[PDB]
């Protein structure tokens, strides 16, 4: 998907409610900011490529990191330790394949 392979009805954690929610804003050099609704384990790849097919960029062209990590297909908000209204870091190449 990404780096690796990342499908839907990930497991979650188990202890971990539905009465709980997160928001994200992604950011980019572009001065594009996007706010986003998540919960514990929603992979953020989805978001990221929601962006990049809205903007029409490659995902391959463009870059997620926060912290210096990468956003994988499989990396959830619990994953990296964020907290809500948090900011994520975008870069975006303009050619690709």
Known sequence: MSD???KPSTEDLGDKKEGEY???????????????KV???THLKKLKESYCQRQG??????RFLFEGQRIAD???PKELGMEEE????????????
């Open 57 to 62: 960029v490659p995902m391959n062209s463009l």
């Open 22 to 36: 997160i928001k994200l804003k992604v950011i980019g050099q572009d001065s594009s900011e996007i706010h986003f």
């Open 86 to 97: 948090d900011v994520i870091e975008v870069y975006q190449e303009q050619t690709g394949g």
């Open 74 to 76: 499989n990396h959830t």
């Open 39 to 41: 919960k514990m384990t």
């Open 4 to 6: 690796q392979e990342a």
